[PDB]
mmCIF file of all heavy atoms in Angstrom:
data_model
loop_
_atom_site.group_PDB
_atom_site.id
_atom_site.type_symbol
_atom_site.label_atom_id
_atom_site.label_comp_id
_atom_site.label_asym_id
_atom_site.label_seq_id
_atom_site.Cartn_x
_atom_site.Cartn_y
_atom_site.Cartn_z
ATOM 1 N N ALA R 41 0.919 -1.081 0.000
ATOM 2 C CA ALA R 41 -0.013 -0.025 -0.034
ATOM 3 C C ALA R 41 0.926 1.217 -0.002
ATOM 4 O O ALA R 41 2.057 1.183 0.617
ATOM 5 C CB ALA R 41 -0.869 0.023 1.287
ATOM 6 N N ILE R 42 0.583 2.222 -0.713
ATOM 7 C CA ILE R 42 1.388 3.460 -0.819
ATOM 8 C C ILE R 42 0.556 4.645 -0.464
ATOM 9 O O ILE R 42 -0.510 4.852 -0.987
ATOM 10 C CB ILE R 42 2.003 3.565 -2.253
ATOM 11 C CG1 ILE R 42 2.868 2.335 -2.704
ATOM 12 C CG2 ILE R 42 2.871 4.888 -2.428
ATOM 13 C CD1 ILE R 42 4.232 2.120 -2.074
ATOM 14 N N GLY R 43 1.032 5.392 0.520
ATOM 15 C CA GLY R 43 0.371 6.576 0.964
ATOM 16 C C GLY R 43 1.226 7.760 0.738
ATOM 17 O O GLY R 43 2.428 7.690 0.755
ATOM 18 N N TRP R 44 0.602 8.911 0.515
ATOM 19 C CA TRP R 44 1.210 10.186 0.330
ATOM 20 C C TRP R 44 0.859 11.054 1.516
ATOM 21 O O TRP R 44 -0.302 11.046 1.951
ATOM 22 C CB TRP R 44 0.706 10.866 -0.993
ATOM 23 C CG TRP R 44 1.412 10.388 -2.247
ATOM 24 C CD1 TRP R 44 0.977 9.452 -3.092
ATOM 25 C CD2 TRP R 44 2.664 10.808 -2.779
ATOM 26 N NE1 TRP R 44 1.822 9.324 -4.154
ATOM 27 C CE2 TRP R 44 2.910 10.145 -3.990
ATOM 28 C CE3 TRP R 44 3.629 11.774 -2.313
ATOM 29 C CZ2 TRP R 44 4.004 10.444 -4.732
ATOM 30 C CZ3 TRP R 44 4.768 11.983 -3.081
ATOM 31 C CH2 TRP R 44 4.947 11.291 -4.310
ATOM 32 N N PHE R 45 1.923 11.658 2.039
ATOM 33 C CA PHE R 45 1.839 12.485 3.251
ATOM 34 C C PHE R 45 2.526 13.778 2.890
ATOM 35 O O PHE R 45 3.278 13.881 1.909
ATOM 36 C CB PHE R 45 2.571 11.775 4.416
ATOM 37 C CG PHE R 45 1.879 10.430 4.787
ATOM 38 C CD1 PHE R 45 2.164 9.284 4.101
ATOM 39 C CD2 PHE R 45 0.981 10.424 5.800
ATOM 40 C CE1 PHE R 45 1.531 8.078 4.414
ATOM 41 C CE2 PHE R 45 0.311 9.250 6.118
ATOM 42 C CZ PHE R 45 0.554 8.112 5.403
ATOM 43 N N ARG R 46 2.250 14.835 3.671
ATOM 44 C CA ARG R 46 2.924 16.130 3.485
ATOM 45 C C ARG R 46 3.170 16.792 4.825
ATOM 46 O O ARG R 46 2.433 16.552 5.803
ATOM 47 C CB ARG R 46 2.049 17.028 2.525
ATOM 48 C CG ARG R 46 0.742 17.536 3.140
ATOM 49 C CD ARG R 46 0.006 18.378 2.106
ATOM 50 N NE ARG R 46 -1.334 18.837 2.640
ATOM 51 C CZ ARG R 46 -2.237 19.493 1.930
ATOM 52 N NH1 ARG R 46 -1.971 19.774 0.650
ATOM 53 N NH2 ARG R 46 -3.365 19.858 2.490
ATOM 54 N N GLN R 47 4.187 17.606 4.882
ATOM 55 C CA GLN R 47 4.525 18.354 6.068
ATOM 56 C C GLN R 47 4.944 19.788 5.670
ATOM 57 O O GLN R 47 5.958 19.935 4.911
ATOM 58 C CB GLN R 47 5.618 17.586 6.916
ATOM 59 C CG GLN R 47 5.954 18.353 8.190
ATOM 60 C CD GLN R 47 6.651 17.482 9.191
ATOM 61 O OE1 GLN R 47 7.655 16.785 8.927
ATOM 62 N NE2 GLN R 47 6.163 17.506 10.412
ATOM 63 N N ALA R 48 4.178 20.751 6.161
ATOM 64 C CA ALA R 48 4.457 22.180 5.941
ATOM 65 C C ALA R 48 5.363 22.592 7.069
ATOM 66 O O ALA R 48 5.343 21.926 8.119
ATOM 67 C CB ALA R 48 3.089 22.920 5.947
ATOM 68 N N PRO R 49 6.179 23.645 6.948
ATOM 69 C CA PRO R 49 7.066 24.038 8.047
ATOM 70 C C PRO R 49 6.330 24.481 9.325
ATOM 71 O O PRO R 49 5.394 25.280 9.220
ATOM 72 C CB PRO R 49 7.982 25.140 7.429
ATOM 73 C CG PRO R 49 7.191 25.675 6.311
ATOM 74 C CD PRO R 49 6.330 24.585 5.777
ATOM 75 N N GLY R 50 6.683 23.883 10.431
ATOM 76 C CA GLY R 50 6.086 24.130 11.755
ATOM 77 C C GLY R 50 4.815 23.387 12.034
ATOM 78 O O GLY R 50 4.235 23.506 13.094
ATOM 79 N N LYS R 51 4.354 22.567 11.032
ATOM 80 C CA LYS R 51 3.111 21.783 11.166
ATOM 81 C C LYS R 51 3.356 20.261 11.290
ATOM 82 O O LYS R 51 4.452 19.800 10.945
ATOM 83 C CB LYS R 51 2.188 22.075 9.966
ATOM 84 C CG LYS R 51 1.636 23.464 9.884
ATOM 85 C CD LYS R 51 0.163 23.514 10.086
ATOM 86 C CE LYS R 51 -0.597 23.633 8.694
ATOM 87 N NZ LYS R 51 -2.052 24.083 8.943
ATOM 88 N N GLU R 52 2.382 19.546 11.737
ATOM 89 C CA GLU R 52 2.493 18.066 11.840
ATOM 90 C C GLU R 52 2.309 17.446 10.442
ATOM 91 O O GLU R 52 1.717 18.026 9.529
ATOM 92 C CB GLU R 52 1.434 17.551 12.841
ATOM 93 C CG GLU R 52 1.573 18.057 14.276
ATOM 94 C CD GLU R 52 2.970 18.018 14.853
ATOM 95 O OE1 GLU R 52 3.556 16.861 14.935
ATOM 96 O OE2 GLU R 52 3.475 19.031 15.343
ATOM 97 N N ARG R 53 2.903 16.261 10.285
ATOM 98 C CA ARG R 53 2.720 15.506 8.995
ATOM 99 C C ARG R 53 1.246 15.080 8.857
ATOM 100 O O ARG R 53 0.651 14.709 9.876
ATOM 101 C CB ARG R 53 3.603 14.274 9.082
ATOM 102 C CG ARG R 53 3.776 13.532 7.745
ATOM 103 C CD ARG R 53 4.383 12.195 7.987
ATOM 104 N NE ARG R 53 3.616 11.325 8.869
ATOM 105 C CZ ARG R 53 4.158 10.478 9.722
ATOM 106 N NH1 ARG R 53 5.470 10.318 9.810
ATOM 107 N NH2 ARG R 53 3.373 9.742 10.523
ATOM 108 N N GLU R 54 0.671 15.200 7.665
ATOM 109 C CA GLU R 54 -0.688 14.768 7.415
ATOM 110 C C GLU R 54 -0.821 14.004 6.136
ATOM 111 O O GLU R 54 -0.245 14.332 5.161
ATOM 112 C CB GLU R 54 -1.622 16.029 7.437
ATOM 113 C CG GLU R 54 -1.414 16.942 6.221
ATOM 114 C CD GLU R 54 -2.468 18.013 5.936
ATOM 115 O OE1 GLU R 54 -3.666 17.805 6.238
ATOM 116 O OE2 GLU R 54 -2.047 19.073 5.426
ATOM 117 N N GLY R 55 -1.600 12.879 6.255
ATOM 118 C CA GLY R 55 -1.884 12.090 5.103
ATOM 119 C C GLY R 55 -2.754 12.836 4.120
ATOM 120 O O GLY R 55 -3.509 13.668 4.528
ATOM 121 N N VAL R 56 -2.578 12.556 2.839
ATOM 122 C CA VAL R 56 -3.407 13.252 1.769
ATOM 123 C C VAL R 56 -4.099 12.209 0.927
ATOM 124 O O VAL R 56 -5.277 12.461 0.597
ATOM 125 C CB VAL R 56 -2.681 14.313 0.954
ATOM 126 C CG1 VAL R 56 -2.286 15.531 1.786
ATOM 127 C CG2 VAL R 56 -1.441 13.770 0.229
ATOM 128 N N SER R 57 -3.480 11.110 0.669
ATOM 129 C CA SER R 57 -4.044 10.139 -0.267
ATOM 130 C C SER R 57 -3.324 8.813 -0.082
ATOM 131 O O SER R 57 -2.162 8.789 0.264
ATOM 132 C CB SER R 57 -3.884 10.581 -1.721
ATOM 133 O OG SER R 57 -4.655 9.689 -2.542
ATOM 134 N N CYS R 58 -4.061 7.690 -0.290
ATOM 135 C CA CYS R 58 -3.493 6.375 -0.103
ATOM 136 C C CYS R 58 -4.059 5.414 -1.080
ATOM 137 O O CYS R 58 -5.285 5.507 -1.455
ATOM 138 C CB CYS R 58 -3.775 5.920 1.334
ATOM 139 S SG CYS R 58 -3.042 4.362 1.812
ATOM 140 N N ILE R 59 -3.281 4.502 -1.582
ATOM 141 C CA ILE R 59 -3.730 3.442 -2.464
ATOM 142 C C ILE R 59 -3.289 2.088 -1.911
ATOM 143 O O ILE R 59 -2.159 1.817 -1.574
ATOM 144 C CB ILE R 59 -3.222 3.662 -3.941
ATOM 145 C CG1 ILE R 59 -3.938 2.619 -4.915
ATOM 146 C CG2 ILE R 59 -1.686 3.689 -4.143
ATOM 147 C CD1 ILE R 59 -4.053 3.038 -6.381
ATOM 148 N N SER R 60 -4.304 1.201 -1.785
ATOM 149 C CA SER R 60 -4.060 -0.150 -1.297
ATOM 150 C C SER R 60 -3.457 -1.026 -2.444
ATOM 151 O O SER R 60 -3.455 -0.685 -3.599
ATOM 152 C CB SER R 60 -5.383 -0.808 -0.834
ATOM 153 O OG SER R 60 -6.218 -1.068 -1.940
ATOM 154 N N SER R 61 -3.038 -2.240 -2.032
ATOM 155 C CA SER R 61 -2.469 -3.217 -3.056
ATOM 156 C C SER R 61 -3.546 -3.730 -3.985
ATOM 157 O O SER R 61 -3.274 -4.145 -5.096
ATOM 158 C CB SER R 61 -1.709 -4.397 -2.331
ATOM 159 O OG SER R 61 -2.679 -4.989 -1.426
ATOM 160 N N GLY R 62 -4.799 -3.684 -3.492
ATOM 161 C CA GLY R 62 -5.978 -4.101 -4.269
ATOM 162 C C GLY R 62 -6.449 -2.981 -5.223
ATOM 163 O O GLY R 62 -7.348 -3.247 -5.999
ATOM 164 N N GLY R 63 -5.906 -1.803 -5.111
ATOM 165 C CA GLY R 63 -6.238 -0.653 -5.946
ATOM 166 C C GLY R 63 -7.245 0.337 -5.395
ATOM 167 O O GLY R 63 -7.571 1.291 -6.093
ATOM 168 N N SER R 64 -7.781 0.103 -4.221
ATOM 169 C CA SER R 64 -8.728 1.024 -3.525
ATOM 170 C C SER R 64 -8.017 2.367 -3.141
ATOM 171 O O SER R 64 -6.820 2.270 -2.732
ATOM 172 C CB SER R 64 -9.303 0.432 -2.326
ATOM 173 O OG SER R 64 -10.198 -0.612 -2.665
ATOM 174 N N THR R 65 -8.683 3.491 -3.390
ATOM 175 C CA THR R 65 -8.072 4.803 -3.085
ATOM 176 C C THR R 65 -8.868 5.545 -2.058
ATOM 177 O O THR R 65 -10.088 5.495 -2.001
ATOM 178 C CB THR R 65 -7.992 5.595 -4.399
ATOM 179 O OG1 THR R 65 -9.263 5.969 -4.829
ATOM 180 C CG2 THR R 65 -7.179 4.930 -5.521
ATOM 181 N N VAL R 66 -8.107 6.298 -1.213
ATOM 182 C CA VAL R 66 -8.706 7.104 -0.151
ATOM 183 C C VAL R 66 -8.088 8.474 -0.213
ATOM 184 O O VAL R 66 -6.866 8.585 -0.546
ATOM 185 C CB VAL R 66 -8.766 6.504 1.280
ATOM 186 C CG1 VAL R 66 -9.674 5.286 1.342
ATOM 187 C CG2 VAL R 66 -7.348 6.178 1.811
ATOM 188 N N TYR R 67 -8.811 9.525 0.159
ATOM 189 C CA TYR R 67 -8.369 10.910 0.093
ATOM 190 C C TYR R 67 -8.821 11.669 1.317
ATOM 191 O O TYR R 67 -9.879 11.465 1.794
ATOM 192 C CB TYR R 67 -9.036 11.565 -1.166
ATOM 193 C CG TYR R 67 -8.626 10.949 -2.529
ATOM 194 C CD1 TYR R 67 -9.382 9.980 -3.113
ATOM 195 C CD2 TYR R 67 -7.423 11.262 -3.049
ATOM 196 C CE1 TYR R 67 -9.036 9.396 -4.308
ATOM 197 C CE2 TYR R 67 -6.981 10.666 -4.228
ATOM 198 C CZ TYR R 67 -7.784 9.721 -4.844
ATOM 199 O OH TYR R 67 -7.374 9.148 -6.053
ATOM 200 N N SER R 68 -7.945 12.569 1.803
ATOM 201 C CA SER R 68 -8.336 13.416 2.913
ATOM 202 C C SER R 68 -9.354 14.395 2.400
ATOM 203 O O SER R 68 -9.444 14.641 1.197
ATOM 204 C CB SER R 68 -7.109 14.103 3.559
ATOM 205 O OG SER R 68 -6.622 15.045 2.624
ATOM 206 N N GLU R 69 -10.172 14.950 3.330
ATOM 207 C CA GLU R 69 -11.197 15.914 2.960
ATOM 208 C C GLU R 69 -10.648 17.139 2.242
ATOM 209 O O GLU R 69 -11.359 17.643 1.347
ATOM 210 C CB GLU R 69 -12.021 16.229 4.262
ATOM 211 C CG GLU R 69 -12.819 15.102 4.848
ATOM 212 C CD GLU R 69 -13.914 14.543 3.940
ATOM 213 O OE1 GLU R 69 -14.851 15.314 3.563
ATOM 214 O OE2 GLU R 69 -13.848 13.332 3.570
ATOM 215 N N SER R 70 -9.490 17.585 2.669
ATOM 216 C CA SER R 70 -8.868 18.786 2.040
ATOM 217 C C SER R 70 -8.460 18.644 0.568
ATOM 218 O O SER R 70 -8.251 19.626 -0.132
ATOM 219 C CB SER R 70 -7.768 19.323 2.908
ATOM 220 O OG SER R 70 -6.747 18.315 3.080
ATOM 221 N N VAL R 71 -8.291 17.369 0.095
ATOM 222 C CA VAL R 71 -7.725 17.156 -1.261
ATOM 223 C C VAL R 71 -8.684 16.295 -2.129
ATOM 224 O O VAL R 71 -8.478 16.114 -3.295
ATOM 225 C CB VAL R 71 -6.299 16.564 -1.236
ATOM 226 C CG1 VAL R 71 -5.366 17.273 -0.279
ATOM 227 C CG2 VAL R 71 -6.277 15.004 -1.011
ATOM 228 N N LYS R 72 -9.820 15.824 -1.524
ATOM 229 C CA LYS R 72 -10.809 14.929 -2.202
ATOM 230 C C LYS R 72 -11.313 15.411 -3.572
ATOM 231 O O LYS R 72 -11.346 14.581 -4.497
ATOM 232 C CB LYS R 72 -11.944 14.687 -1.211
ATOM 233 C CG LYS R 72 -12.710 13.380 -1.463
ATOM 234 C CD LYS R 72 -13.839 13.286 -0.442
ATOM 235 C CE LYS R 72 -14.582 11.956 -0.503
ATOM 236 N NZ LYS R 72 -13.636 10.876 -0.124
ATOM 237 N N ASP R 73 -11.578 16.674 -3.743
ATOM 238 C CA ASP R 73 -12.076 17.102 -5.054
ATOM 239 C C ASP R 73 -10.959 17.567 -6.031
ATOM 240 O O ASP R 73 -11.325 18.144 -7.079
ATOM 241 C CB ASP R 73 -13.119 18.268 -4.894
ATOM 242 C CG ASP R 73 -14.290 17.948 -3.936
ATOM 243 O OD1 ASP R 73 -14.660 16.795 -3.780
ATOM 244 O OD2 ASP R 73 -14.822 18.905 -3.291
ATOM 245 N N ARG R 74 -9.746 17.291 -5.706
ATOM 246 C CA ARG R 74 -8.562 17.864 -6.470
ATOM 247 C C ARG R 74 -7.505 16.880 -6.838
ATOM 248 O O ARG R 74 -6.799 17.112 -7.749
ATOM 249 C CB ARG R 74 -7.952 19.027 -5.713
ATOM 250 C CG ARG R 74 -8.852 20.143 -5.331
ATOM 251 C CD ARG R 74 -8.406 20.735 -3.973
ATOM 252 N NE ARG R 74 -7.120 21.368 -4.128
ATOM 253 C CZ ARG R 74 -6.223 21.543 -3.143
ATOM 254 N NH1 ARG R 74 -6.503 21.180 -1.918
ATOM 255 N NH2 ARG R 74 -5.076 22.119 -3.449
ATOM 256 N N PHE R 75 -7.194 15.874 -5.933
ATOM 257 C CA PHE R 75 -6.038 14.927 -6.206
ATOM 258 C C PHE R 75 -6.550 13.599 -6.718
ATOM 259 O O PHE R 75 -7.715 13.225 -6.388
ATOM 260 C CB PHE R 75 -5.218 14.796 -4.927
ATOM 261 C CG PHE R 75 -4.423 15.947 -4.320
ATOM 262 C CD1 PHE R 75 -4.670 17.236 -4.760
ATOM 263 C CD2 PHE R 75 -3.464 15.746 -3.340
ATOM 264 C CE1 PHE R 75 -3.967 18.326 -4.213
ATOM 265 C CE2 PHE R 75 -2.795 16.850 -2.799
ATOM 266 C CZ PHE R 75 -3.019 18.129 -3.211
ATOM 267 N N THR R 76 -5.659 12.923 -7.447
ATOM 268 C CA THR R 76 -5.906 11.550 -7.912
ATOM 269 C C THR R 76 -4.627 10.764 -7.638
ATOM 270 O O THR R 76 -3.530 11.147 -8.077
ATOM 271 C CB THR R 76 -6.342 11.496 -9.386
ATOM 272 O OG1 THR R 76 -7.437 12.371 -9.609
ATOM 273 C CG2 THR R 76 -6.762 10.125 -9.804
ATOM 274 N N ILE R 77 -4.754 9.650 -6.945
ATOM 275 C CA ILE R 77 -3.663 8.749 -6.699
ATOM 276 C C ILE R 77 -3.809 7.545 -7.678
ATOM 277 O O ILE R 77 -4.959 7.112 -7.834
ATOM 278 C CB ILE R 77 -3.510 8.310 -5.177
ATOM 279 C CG1 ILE R 77 -2.148 7.636 -4.884
ATOM 280 C CG2 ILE R 77 -4.730 7.475 -4.712
ATOM 281 C CD1 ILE R 77 -1.837 7.359 -3.417
ATOM 282 N N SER R 78 -2.753 7.074 -8.270
ATOM 283 C CA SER R 78 -2.794 5.910 -9.180
ATOM 284 C C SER R 78 -1.465 5.142 -9.143
ATOM 285 O O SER R 78 -0.501 5.650 -8.614
ATOM 286 C CB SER R 78 -3.189 6.267 -10.652
ATOM 287 O OG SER R 78 -2.290 7.305 -11.127
#
């Protein structure tokens, strides 16, 4: 499974998107209408 995370300076690390080995995708609420993981 591959997940994408991001860290802005002075902020905590936050997940943005994740793809399982089966191909299922999940998105955080802040990036849901904008990002695509493949």
Side-chain angles (χ1 to χ4, degrees):
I42 305 284
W44 278 99
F45 297 84
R46 69 180 176 188
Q47 181 162 51
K51 295 244 261 195
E52 298 312 304
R53 190 191 60 214
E54 67 168 328
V56 291
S57 188
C58 183
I59 189 156
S60 73
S61 56
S64 291
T65 67
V66 296
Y67 297 97
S68 67
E69 293 296 300
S70 56
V71 314
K72 203 180 190 65
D73 307 332
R74 303 147 67 206
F75 295 12
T76 308
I77 193 171
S78 53

